[PDB]
Amino acid sequence: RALPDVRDGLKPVHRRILYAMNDLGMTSDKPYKKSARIVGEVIGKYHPHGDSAVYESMVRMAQDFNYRYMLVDGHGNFGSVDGDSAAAMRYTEARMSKISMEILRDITKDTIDYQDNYDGSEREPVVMPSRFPNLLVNGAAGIAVGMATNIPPHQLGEIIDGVLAVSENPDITIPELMEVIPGPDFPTAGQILGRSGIRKAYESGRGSITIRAKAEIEQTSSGKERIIVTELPYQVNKAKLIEKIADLVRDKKIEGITDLRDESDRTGMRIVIEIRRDANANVILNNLYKQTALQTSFGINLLALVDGQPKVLTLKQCLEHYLDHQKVVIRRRTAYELRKAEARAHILEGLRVALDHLDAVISLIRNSQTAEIARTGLIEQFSLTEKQAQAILDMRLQRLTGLEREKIEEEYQSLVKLIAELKDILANEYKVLEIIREELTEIKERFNDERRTEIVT
Amino acid sequence: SRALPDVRDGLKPVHRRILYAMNDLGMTSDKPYKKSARIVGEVIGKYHPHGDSAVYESMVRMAQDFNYRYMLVDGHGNFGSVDGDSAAAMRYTEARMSKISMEILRDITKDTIDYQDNYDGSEREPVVMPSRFPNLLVNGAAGIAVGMATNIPPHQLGEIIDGVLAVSENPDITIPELMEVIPGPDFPTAGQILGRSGIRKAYESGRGSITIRAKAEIEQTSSGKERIIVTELPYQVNKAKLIEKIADLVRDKKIEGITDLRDESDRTGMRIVIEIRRDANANVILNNLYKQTALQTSFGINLLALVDGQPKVLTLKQCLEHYLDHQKVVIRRRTAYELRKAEARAHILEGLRVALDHLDAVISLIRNSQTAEIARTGLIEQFSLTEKQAQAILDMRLQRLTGLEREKIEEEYQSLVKLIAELKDILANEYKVLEIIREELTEIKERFNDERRTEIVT
Ligand SMILES: [K+]
Numbered sequence: 001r002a003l004p005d006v007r008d009g010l011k012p013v014h015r016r017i018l019y020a021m022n023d024l025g026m027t028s029d030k031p032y033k034k035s036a037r038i039v040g041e042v043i044g045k046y047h048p049h050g051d052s053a054v055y056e057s058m059v060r061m062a063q064d065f066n067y068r069y070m071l072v073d074g075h076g077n078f079g080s081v082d083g084d085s086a087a088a089m090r091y092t093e094a095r096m097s098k099i100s101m102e103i104l105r106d107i108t109k110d111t112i113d114y115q116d117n118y119d120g121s122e123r124e125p126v127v128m129p130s131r132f133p134n135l136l137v138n139g140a141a142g143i144a145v146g147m148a149t150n151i152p153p154h155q156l157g158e159i160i161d162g163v164l165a166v167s168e169n170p171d172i173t174i175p176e177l178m179e180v181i182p183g184p185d186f187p188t189a190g191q192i193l194g195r196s197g198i199r200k201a202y203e204s205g206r207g208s209i210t211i212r213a214k215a216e217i218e219q220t221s222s223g224k225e226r227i228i229v230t231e232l233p234y235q236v237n238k239a240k241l242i243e244k245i246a247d248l249v250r251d252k253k254i255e256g257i258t259d260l261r262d263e264s265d266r267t268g269m270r271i272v273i274e275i276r277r278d279a280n281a282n283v284i285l286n287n288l289y290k291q292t293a294l295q296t297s298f299g300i301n302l303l304a305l306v307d308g309q310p311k312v313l314t315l316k317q318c319l320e321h322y323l324d325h326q327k328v329v330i331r332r333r334t335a336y337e338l339r340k341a342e343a344r345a346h347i348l349e350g351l352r353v354a355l356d357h358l359d360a361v362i363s364l365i366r367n368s369q370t371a372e373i374a375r376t377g378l379i380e381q382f383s384l385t386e387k388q389a390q391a392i393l394d395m396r397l398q399r400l401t402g403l404e405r406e407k408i409e410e411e412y413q414s415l416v417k418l419i420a421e422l423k424d425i426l427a428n429e430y431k432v433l434e435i436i437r438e439e440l441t442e443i444k445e446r447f448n449d450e451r452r453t454e455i456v457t
Numbered sequence: 458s459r460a461l462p463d464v465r466d467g468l469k470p471v472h473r474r475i476l477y478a479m480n481d482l483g484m485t486s487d488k489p490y491k492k493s494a495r496i497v498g499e500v501i502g503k504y505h506p507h508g509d510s511a512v513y514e515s516m517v518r519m520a521q522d523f524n525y526r527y528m529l530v531d532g533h534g535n536f537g538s539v540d541g542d543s544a545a546a547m548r549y550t551e552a553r554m555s556k557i558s559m560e561i562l563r564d565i566t567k568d569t570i571d572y573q574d575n576y577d578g579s580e581r582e583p584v585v586m587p588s589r590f591p592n593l594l595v596n597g598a599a600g601i602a603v604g605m606a607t608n609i610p611p612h613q614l615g616e617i618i619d620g621v622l623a624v625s626e627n628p629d630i631t632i633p634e635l636m637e638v639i640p641g642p643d644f645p646t647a648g649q650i651l652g653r654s655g656i657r658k659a660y661e662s663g664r665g666s667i668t669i670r671a672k673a674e675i676e677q678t679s680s681g682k683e684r685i686i687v688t689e690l691p692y693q694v695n696k697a698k699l700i701e702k703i704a705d706l707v708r709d710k711k712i713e714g715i716t717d718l719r720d721e722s723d724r725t726g727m728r729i730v731i732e733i734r735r736d737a738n739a740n741v742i743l744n745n746l747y748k749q750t751a752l753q754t755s756f757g758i759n760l761l762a763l764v765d766g767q768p769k770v771l772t773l774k775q776c777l778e779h780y781l782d783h784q785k786v787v788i789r790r791r792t793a794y795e796l797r798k799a800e801a802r803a804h805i806l807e808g809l810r811v812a813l814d815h816l817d818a819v820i821s822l823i824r825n826s827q828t829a830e831i832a833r834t835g836l837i838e839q840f841s842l843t844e845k846q847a848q849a850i851l852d853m854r855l856q857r858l859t860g861l862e863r864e865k866i867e868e869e870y871q872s873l874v875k876l877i878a879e880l881k882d883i884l885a886n887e888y889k890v891l892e893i894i895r896e897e898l899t900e901i902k903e904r905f906n907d908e909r910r911t912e913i914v915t
């Protein structure tokens with residue numbers, strides 16, 4: 001509906017793009033492939049809306065200034081903070097980022113339900129396993145005519161610790177939670193102005209906050225002062241802001257600005273505003289803050305798709321729905337692991353029946369004209385599956401060494417303890433909760449960076 | 458290195474690098490055309506760092522029907538024409554190997570040719586192709602290096618092969634005996650060679666001059682009007698600039714009697730029509746033309762190539778001989794490699810036959826062994842096997858023990874003993890090797906041969 005699912009935090013388009021990229025092998029390890037490919041694939045098979053929408057969607061997940069943790073690894077010009085747009089899809093290259101690899105984890109293991117695509121030809125997921133909490137981390141900035149969400153990004157470490165927090169204490173209160181998730185954290189750092197707007201948004205669902213650029217004031221040995229901006233409010237166009245300020249000084253609305261020069265580069269942003277040796281830098285800085293987009297309003301609205309219905313939600317509610325999602329995902333995946341494991345244990349019993357009547361099995365195979373004849377032979381003389389028989393036949397002779405037979409019994413017994421343990425994990429919810437904690441902690445310790453936005457009190 | 462062809466495969470270095478690079482990247486005769494830029498890039502980065510100009514124009518020349526007697530490169534796009542228009546930029550053309558150059562590369566995988574390091578010791582390029590048909594005589598060579606200039610003209614594939622076999626059978630064959638087989642050159646642009654004498658000097662000595670001539674014949678209108686029609690022109694002569702030259706020659710009034718000049722050349726081929734007023738004999742005018750323009754030209758033959766990396770001027774028979782020595786070397790190395798392979802696989806099979814033969818004992822030895830290491834030294838000492846064979850026995854899946862599989866092993870081993878036999882014999886008996894070369898070369902002739910285009914008038 002434009003609105004993201006609460007469980008994986010993806011609009012239709014993003015979920016499709018990702019799924020295709022992962023179908024077409026465009027993963028984090030594998031090399032890049034031309035955008036045009038992932039786009040046309042998606043257009044044809046899952047999301048029929050045009051190079052326009054699909055490409056721009058893909059691109060947006062590649063942009064470090066739009067995503068707190070970019071899902072799409074992009075190579076080439078995927079546009080910039082100054083507003084220039086990306087190069088044509090014939091000229092770019094793309095793949096899944098290391099982190100989105102987590103969004104797709106365990107999708108093979110029967111953890112999500114698939115549905116038919118537009119024409120009934122293929123299949124797409126209805127939700128990704130989404131092994132780290134994507135909605136709160138990366139956001140939702142989609143504004144449409146009926147319902148327009150606007151969920152700001154958050155430091156990944158924070159959100160994880162908060163989901164864990166709600167795990168251990170289901171009746172946490174919004175403020176107790178806020179000591180873990182102190183507020184948003186923009187891919188372009190800033191300063192958020194008040195704790196109040198944040199609190200209002202997390203408790204209620206909707207509410208407004210003030211984001212603000214990071215500007216210091218360097219001072220020369222002769223006491224001349226320069227203002228230097230190194231960060232801007234999430235989603236302000238640097239180029240348009242510079243033209244704006246330049247414009248005000250030209251109109252004579254701000255008095256005391258000498259030159260305004262952009263010195264940003266590979267080493268980072270650096271807008272430099274010069275001030276007459278007379279005027280008070282500070283003041284000028286505040287009148288900039290008030291006049292331009294060096295400081296702006298961000299309107300939070302926590303609206304998303306809860307079971308196919310647009311719902312506004314509180315911080316605790318988002319956390320909880322995500323955690324329910326992980327519970328299904330983990331229970332199911334462990335169903336899968338139980339199946340797998342039981343099956344391999346079956347084969348192992350076979351190889352043990354064999355290793356235990358080795359001589360007779362050997363005489364029987366060597367007195368068998370065909371492999372087929374031998375299989376039906378093993379079946380009938382030892383009470384085995386085709387599965388097991390063919391497993392015997394595929395056994396290299398060095399699997400008959402002492403230490404290898406020991407490694408078989410080792411593995412089999414070990415797999416017995418696993419079938420039983422998995423069975424239990426199905427049966428007891430606390431074990432499943434533990435799995436989520438362990439796995440989320442791995443993800444935190446692998447993908448966690450420092451917090452970019454300093455929230456001022 | 459040196460801008461001269463190697464006697465064995467007949468390529469300048471640059472050509473040999475373009476072909477090696479192409480075959481290496483899978484731009485073969487079957488597989489789809491690739492962007493020129495890709496092949497030129499690979500060549501410049503890897504083997505021949507001397508500009509996309511030289512490399513791509515080299516690649517272009519090998520693709521033109523009118524320069525190469527038997528085009529080595531299958532091109533696609535605008536590779537030009539005999540009108541002097543150059544090929545279009547490498548961003549605009551695609552290319553691949555031609556069906557005939559697949560023969561230039563045959564057997565290169567099988568240790569038939571040595572490699573050397575490339576210009577920065579990061580890659581390896583061959584020093585010489587296998588060259589399974591005589592490319593130096595067939596396609597020719599031209600160009601200067603270390604002062605000397607080489608100018609070998611193209612030939613008919615049928616003729617050169619028939620000669621190579623001729624030298625194979627009769628190693629004492631003489632240049633006029635040899636000539637009854639190879640009449641003379643055969644240019645891609647068809648037409649006339651005038652002297653049997655010129656050709657003879659050229660083949661017998663190494664250097665010689667030959668006289669090439671346009672194929673012009675005098676037609677007759679029902680009005681008693683005459684008109685010469687040129688359907689063929691001499692090798693390397695520019696059609697455009699000759700129409701030009703004749704325009705000026707008649708315009709300055711250097712030659713008179715000429716009435717009209719039209720280039721009716723089209724899809725059907727060349728038809729240059731020149732009109733004559735009834736006052737003048739078209740024959741005498743034709744002769745003035747041969748004399749004054751490029752309707753008749755001098756071709757300077759000089760059979761200069763690289764024998765062991767040294768420029769030498771060879772006589773026809775020495776060329777044929779040097780090519781035949783190369784191919785003899787090649788078949789010897791190839792069948793040596795095939796034998797290395799064979800002997801190896803048959804070794805392993807000998808191992809497996811030993812194991813199946815005493816099956817029980819081997820099984821029990823393995824299972825009374827603690828490690829694969831322990832088992833390996835076990836079998837080795839017990840049955841006199843190699844590590845290679847022992848390992849191979851340990852790697853044997855159990856279904857290999859079925860009857861049908863033991864039968865398959867015995868069959869492959871059989872086949873293989875037969876093949877090591879035949880191989881060792883080909884090696885020891887040079888007449889067998891010569892036989893191979895005759896068979897293979899005659900298959901190539903059977904598959905690629907065409908009609909002589911240049912008529913040797915006497
Ligand atoms: K403002």
Ligand SMILES: [K+]
Pocket residue numbers: 747748749750751752753754
């Ligand atoms: K002349």
